[PDB]
């Protein structure tokens, strides 16, 4: 049942978590990135240096065609291709097969990643943000319409933290995507849900931020200007320009004893410490409060620095441990990326227009602190925190 979907994702925050799927009759196996930050199902359909395989449209008995092109632009990366449909399957997912819209990517810039080990992308967000337009039923919509698979999914993403190599991205277990349900063995404590403000991105509303127990005291709108989303396909936690400066100040200050290249805080440069020397305790926790399910009720998730200091391999290719700053600046709203998701079991309860958080079974723990999901809290005028035009 759901056991068979446990551990069905591979990858890392920096390059994406992917799932295995087949497409076409006869079936063609492909690794697909799992993206809650977009709407389109797309796959390589023509050679590319970073692609170890691709979708041959002309070998599927079942490939239909729409003779309609598509362009999809992301914050970074973009692709162009031809629209058709085909039968699709998830070996380590539910036992069903659906005919779903599929973009065959013909041309692309900055979208496929060197030795990422995926060749496609699965946009799980809602039709409203699908290209060329909504009419284009995203995959999950198809799956729910054509089958008895319930309308929700869960994502438990894990980051292993000794920089992962390409022979380790195959070997590592990055996580689990439970289709059509919640697997209770994969989290502890209880689930806290925040409503999905609107069904396009999975867009939530942040009502308070604290760093090591201190409120930034900003007007909430600032936290959700012009939106906050949950995006498995974005690596970093991306804050809007004011919130970002505020958080960086607080974090610099808290970590004053030590010195970092000015490009460190822009997430351009690494920092390294003697292996197992890194002074985690001088980096603060960050608590995000989310709108709850009941009037004047909030809850919070606490992010450890282990998450916002992402690991990567040395400039000398030496043992001592290195990291990139996984908090970055946004001109297009708050994005709770994979680093933020890594700690948690996240339920995308599309059916009840909500998203739940609980501490993940996976989450790595620093000695004296622990990631948490706690409530209830009281918070007034939460609707005022949503940004409108």
């Amino acid at each position: 049942s759901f056991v068979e979907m446990v551990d069905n994702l591979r990858g890392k925050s920096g390059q994406g978590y992917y799932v295995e799927m087949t497409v076409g009759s006869p079936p063609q196996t492909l690794n697909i990135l799992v993206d809650t930050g977009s709407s389109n199902f797309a796959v390589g359909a023509a050679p590319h240096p970073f692609l170890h395989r691709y979708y041959q449209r002309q070998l599927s008995s079942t490939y239909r065609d729409l003779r309609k092109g598509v362009y999809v632009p992301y914050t970074q990366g973009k692709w162009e291709g031809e629209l058709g449909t085909d039968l699709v399957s998830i070996p380590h997912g539910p036992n069903v097969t659906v005919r779903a819209n599929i973009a065959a990517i013909t041309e692309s810039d900055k979208f496929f990643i060197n030795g990422s080990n995926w060749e496609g992308i699965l946009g799980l967000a809602y039709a409203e943000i699908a290209r060329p337009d909504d009419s284009l039923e995203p995959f999950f919509d198809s799956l729910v319409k054509q089958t008895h698979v319930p309308n929700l999914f869960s994502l438990q993403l894990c980051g292993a933290g000794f920089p992962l190599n390409q022979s380790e991205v195959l070997a590592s277990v990055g996580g689990s995507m439970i289709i059509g349900g919640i697997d209770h063995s994969l989290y502890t404590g209880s689930l806290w849900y925040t409503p999905i403000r609107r069904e396009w991105y999975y867009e939530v509303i942040i009502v308070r931020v604290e760093i090591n127990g201190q409120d930034l005291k900003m007007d909430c709108k600032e936290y959700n200007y012009d939106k906050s989303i949950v995006d498995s396909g974005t690596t970093n936690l991306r804050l809007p320009k004011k919130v970002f400066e505020a958080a960086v100040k607080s974090i610099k200050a808290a970590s004053s004893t030590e010195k970092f290249p000015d490009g460190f805080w822009l997430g351009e440069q690494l920092v390294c410490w003697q292996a197992g020397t890194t002074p985690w305790n001088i980096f603060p926790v960050i608590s995000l409060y989310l709108m709850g399910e009941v009037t004047n009720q909030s809850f919070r998730i606490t992010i450890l620095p282990q998450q916002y200091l992402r690991p990567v391999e040395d400039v000398a290719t030496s043992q001592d441990d290195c990291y990139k700053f996984a908090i970055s600046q946004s001109s297009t709203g708050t994005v709770m990326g994979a680093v933020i998701m890594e700690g948690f079991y996240v339920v995308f309860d599309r059916a009840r227009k909500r998203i739940g958080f609980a501490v993940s079974a996976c989450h790595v723990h620093d000695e004296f602190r622990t990631a948490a999901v706690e409530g209830p809290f009281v918070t007034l005028d939460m609707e005022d925190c949503g940004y409108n035009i």
Partner: peptide, 4 residues
């Protein structure tokens, strides 16, 4: 690193 990846970025919608």
């Amino acid at each position: 690193e990846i970025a919608x």
